[PDB]
Amino acid sequence: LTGTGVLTESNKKFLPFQQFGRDIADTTDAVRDPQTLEILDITPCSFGGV
Amino acid sequence: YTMSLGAENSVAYSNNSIAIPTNFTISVTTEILPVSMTKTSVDCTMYICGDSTECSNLLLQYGSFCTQLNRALTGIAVEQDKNTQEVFAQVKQIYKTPPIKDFGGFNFSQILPDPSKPSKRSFIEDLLFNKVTKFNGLTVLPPLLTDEMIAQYTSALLAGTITSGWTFGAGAALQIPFAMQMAYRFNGIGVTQNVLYENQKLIANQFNSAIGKIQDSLSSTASALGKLQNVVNQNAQALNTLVKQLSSNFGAISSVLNDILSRLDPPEAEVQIDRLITGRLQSLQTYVTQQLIRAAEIRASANLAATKMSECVLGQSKRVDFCGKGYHLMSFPQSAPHGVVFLHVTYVPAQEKNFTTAPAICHDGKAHFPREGVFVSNGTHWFVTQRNFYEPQIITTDNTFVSGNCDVVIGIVNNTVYDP
Amino acid sequence: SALGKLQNVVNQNAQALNTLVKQLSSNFGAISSVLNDILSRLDPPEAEVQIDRLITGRLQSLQTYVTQQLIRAAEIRASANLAATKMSECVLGQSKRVDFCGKGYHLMSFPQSAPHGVVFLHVTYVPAQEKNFTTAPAICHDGKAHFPREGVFVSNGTHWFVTQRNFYEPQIITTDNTFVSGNCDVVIGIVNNTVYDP
Amino acid sequence: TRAGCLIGAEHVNNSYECDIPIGAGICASYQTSQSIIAYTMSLGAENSVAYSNNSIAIPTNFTISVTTEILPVSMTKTSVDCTMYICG
């Protein structure tokens, strides 16, 4: 699962058997670590305009 | 069933019979119409090829398919501010009402701004605001005019209308008592000014009752603001469909560009990437065209708003049904989310009576016609009265003018004309 | 900078045509943006393959240009209708609509032509110098209440006059400027005075 | 700013009829030691009218003014061939 962003620590939900978290688009919002068992949260970098 | 167009009615028409009202009724309507919509902005490169230099090497052979979308969106965004400015910035200075509200009995406390609230907004517009309810290169720019400036504009407009009549739109504001202004407004619809002075308390009570009933009509039923709500609904749906279009394969092996780039060799990745690019280009083009058409219609709505504010708030209007059903008296603007609200105060005739008329009257072989008004008869005597309100007077040589003789007019009658 | 409205129409058309011309220099996925270059190097079985992409790209460019032209033409038609209405009402007559033919009371207008446009010179009337006065809705004389016919009652401080509402021009109150209606115990704010009988 | 952050312009506590809009009721202008300032736009000069129940103001003079209104009426008479453009 490639991609860039910031890995903030979020208690999104229990996720008893789930791994991925999705949004309106095909955007993985939260992912579960493969090594340990924690719920990380994906937030994209800063956008804007000049 | 089969729809019915209305209640059937047949008037009692005859060659000598008139109906003249003997009373009136002040009514306050409400007109809602949008002014501006949301200023959105989309970045083409970030939308199509998300932070992928391999995809950005492509989409460059297509030429200038990315700058035209930005130019059109910027044009729409700068058009919205012009719409709002031309709708609201009609006044040159910022007037304010005096601290003492001696307006002849009328009560404008419901529409005047409330100093107690942190935002200087009145009660009606607070009800209006309470009645009305991403990361893929899509941004929403903030409007140039914050809601406080709009409230200040509509407060200056109300203070000018109340304290100076229509004189603040032509030159400089000239103070005038509210009763005299209302007498001038009745004089502008063909009703003698003495009617207001003789029925001032009744007119004030009717106006207060109507302005109170407006609150009950608004704060209870929320179906009135649909014309303003559907604009937001349409924009939110268009944006949602644009976002939802990123989850489509368009014939490629995957709808996400990172799996394609991390799964296929460089020489044959462009085969899928070009199809993805084409699909997203078509989706952007359709969205841009729809936004252009919607903004084109919103501009016409805003032009109508500006014309109605100019001709209806800053002065009395003689155009029929332009400012509500009935004879127009005055209007009060109110701000609203992405729109404006008018409160048209109109004069509606009331209980009427049957009479008997005559085009002219023979006195000594001469034919007297009324200067202004109509000859009527209650059965025994003949009177002259104004056309919009029953007020009989004796027929003299100051109400009528002589022209011609009796052997030409069809329907002339006999009576005596008193000479003062 | 006064004629920006007419200058933007020209600039927008010029830039639209310029972009349409610039679109001729795009590969669109083929090996070259020149039909003759492709036609002098490849066999027709692959020449058709390399030409379909150019055909598609240029067709899409033409479609986009035509759509934008249609929208701009509709906007110009709306503006032209507004101009026709203004010519019908401000010039060929006198308009009572507020702020339609200029700020202030409208008197007359003169049309002047311009490149792809028209220019109006609205002549308007504007009041200049004001003065405070004391007013009264009516005057009770002999129990009767006299109301002004087409004027307003003013008072410089000692005497009372009737004047037109748009230009200070005081006159003596007589029975020719006022009309009688009812008695003088109903109106709020009536003022005692004497009405001269000529 | 409520729209973003602006670097290179100095904030000013005054309020003028603004030249360059920015957003959320904030504008920028070039003024005097020359520099670019950013203030809160002023939407008009404050005024209060002396209203009372027996006072009226009547003009005693006038002035004639000639205004200008400029509006477009037609656009360029362009026509494009299709076959010669695509497959000339």
Ligand SMILES: *[C@@H]1O[C@H](CO)[C@@H](O[C@@H]2O[C@H](CO)[C@@H](O)[C@H](O)[C@H]2NC(C)=O)[C@H](O)[C@H]1NC(C)=O
């Ligand atoms: C004209 O109509 C108004 C109301 O439509 C009348 O005012 C009412 O008069 C009755 C007297 O029987 C009162 O009980 C009501 O309270 C009045 N209503 C209001 C709102 O004041 C008025 O009397 C009518 N005019 C004439 C000449 O009868």
Ligand SMILES: *[C@@H]1O[C@H](CO)[C@@H](O[C@@H]2O[C@H](CO)[C@@H](O)[C@H](O)[C@H]2NC(C)=O)[C@H](O)[C@H]1NC(C)=O
């Ligand atoms: C104008 O209307 C408002 C509201 O209808 C009046 O304010 C009310 O006054 C009564 C006293 O008679 C109070 O009991 C209410 O609580 C007030 N309501 C609000 C919302 O303040 C106001 O008095 C009216 N103006 C005049 C001059 O009477």
Ligand SMILES: *[C@@H]1O[C@H](CO)[C@@H](O[C@@H]2O[C@H](CO)[C@@H](O)[C@H](O)[C@H]2NC(C)=O)[C@H](O)[C@H]1NC(C)=O
């Ligand atoms: C038609 O109007 C005339 C004028 O007012 C009426 O004549 C008056 O009638 C009243 C009674 O309602 C008497 O007190 C007056 O003395 C009458 N005036 C004169 C000059 O005689 C007449 O009654 C009305 N007709 C009807 C059928 O109501």
Ligand SMILES: *[C@@H]1O[C@H](CO)[C@@H](O[C@@H]2O[C@H](CO)[C@@H](O)[C@H](O)[C@H]2NC(C)=O)[C@H](O)[C@H]1NC(C)=O
């Ligand atoms: C109105 O009055 C006139 C005159 O007072 C009436 O004219 C009469 O017409 C008839 C018909 O030829 C003559 O015989 C009479 O001599 C006329 N009267 C006079 C005094 O000369 C007329 O008929 C009257 N009309 C109505 C409707 O009453």
Ligand SMILES: *[C@@H]1O[C@H](CO)[C@@H](O[C@@H]2O[C@H](CO)[C@@H](O)[C@H](O)[C@H]2NC(C)=O)[C@H](O)[C@H]1NC(C)=O
């Ligand atoms: C208000 O107007 C009246 C009417 O013109 C003024 O009365 C005249 O005042 C002048 C003063 O120069 C005398 O010469 C006249 O004889 C007065 N006329 C009458 C009929 O008395 C009055 O002075 C004005 N008041 C003010 C304060 O200007």
Ligand SMILES: *[C@@H]1O[C@H](CO)[C@@H](O[C@@H]2O[C@H](CO)[C@@H](O)[C@H](O)[C@H]2NC(C)=O)[C@H](O)[C@H]1NC(C)=O
């Ligand atoms: C206008 O003049 C009348 C008199 O013609 C004044 O009426 C008098 O009012 C006083 C005060 O109540 C009474 O004592 C008198 O009896 C009244 N006179 C008559 C003949 O009824 C009236 O007050 C004057 N108006 C003003 C504003 O001064």
Ligand SMILES: *[C@@H]1O[C@H](CO)[C@@H](O[C@@H]2O[C@H](CO)[C@@H](O)[C@H](O)[C@H]2NC(C)=O)[C@H](O)[C@H]1NC(C)=O
């Ligand atoms: C009404 O205003 C006009 C100008 O708006 C006045 O005309 C000017 O009067 C001054 C007198 O000091 C002259 O110096 C100017 O040359 C005049 N201007 C023009 C264009 O003629 C006029 O005097 C004012 N009228 C009154 C009664 O005050």
Ligand SMILES: *[C@@H]1O[C@H](CO)[C@@H](O)[C@H](O)[C@H]1NC(C)=O
């Ligand atoms: C594998 O990961 C688990 C996760 O906690 C850890 O407990 C274990 O020691 C790891 N084993 C090795 C060989 O790294």
Ligand SMILES: *[C@@H]1O[C@H](CO)[C@@H](O)[C@H](O)[C@H]1NC(C)=O
């Ligand atoms: C006037 O006459 C018509 C028909 O003659 C009748 O229907 C109507 O009720 C009358 N109006 C009044 C106030 O009596």
Ligand SMILES: *[C@@H]1O[C@H](CO)[C@@H](O)[C@H](O)[C@H]1NC(C)=O
């Ligand atoms: C009015 O119409 C009636 C028919 O009901 C007729 O007898 C009478 O002569 C007519 N009078 C006028 C003045 O038209």
Ligand SMILES: *[C@@H]1O[C@H](CO)[C@@H](O)[C@H](O)[C@H]1NC(C)=O
């Ligand atoms: C009229 O009076 C008000 C206050 O009483 C004052 O502000 C205004 O300047 C006066 N107008 C003139 C023309 O003197």
Ligand SMILES: *[C@@H]1O[C@H](CO)[C@@H](O)[C@H](O)[C@H]1NC(C)=O
């Ligand atoms: C105007 O208001 C004052 C209160 O300051 C009052 O004394 C006076 O009677 C009022 N006059 C009219 C005509 O309303």
Ligand SMILES: *[C@@H]1O[C@H](CO)[C@@H](O)[C@H](O)[C@H]1NC(C)=O
């Ligand atoms: C503007 O005034 C406020 C106090 O009202 C002050 O805190 C601020 O520093 C001032 N701005 C500048 C640029 O001096």
